[PDB]
């Protein structure tokens, strides 16, 4: 038994069609952005080229400097943002 309380900024994104070299994550002001693009390449059906951009407003209280991101083997992008707090060792 484990309690499921509410938490901090955190999202997941399906980006399976893009390689790690085709994905950029950046903090611009109060926003995290995600930009993904791949040039035309063949797939099962024929040829395809894809691009998207996503912007999320960082909630108040959240340190834009502690935004982390990670990509899973299955093509799942996560971005997390902890809340600001007093620096420590």
Note the residues at the interface with a second copy (CB under 8 A): 1-12, 14, 16, 20-21, 23-29, 31-33, 35, 37, 40, 43-57, 59, 64, 67-74, 76-80
CB of 84 to a second copy, least distance (A): 16
Cβ-based neighbour number of residue 32 at 10 Å:
23
Beta carbon nearer to a second copy, 3 or 87: 3
Of 56, 46, 47, 48, whose CA–CA distance to 13 is shortest? 56
CB of 86 to a second copy, least distance (A): 21
Exposed, middle or buried by CB within 10 Å (0-12, 13-18, 19+), for 71?
middle
């Amino acid at each position: 038994q484990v309690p499921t309380d509410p938490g901090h900024f955190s999202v997941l994104l399906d980006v399976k069609h893009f390689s790690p070299e085709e994905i950029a994550v950046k903090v611009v002001g109060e926003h995290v952005e995600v930009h993904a693009r791949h040039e035309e390449r063949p797939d099962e059906h024929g040829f395809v080229a894809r691009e998207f951009h996503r912007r999320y407003r960082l909630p108040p209280g959240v340190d834009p400097a502690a935004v982390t991101s990670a990509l899973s083997p299955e093509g799942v992008l996560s971005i997390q943002a902890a809340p600001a707090s007093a620096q420590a060792p």
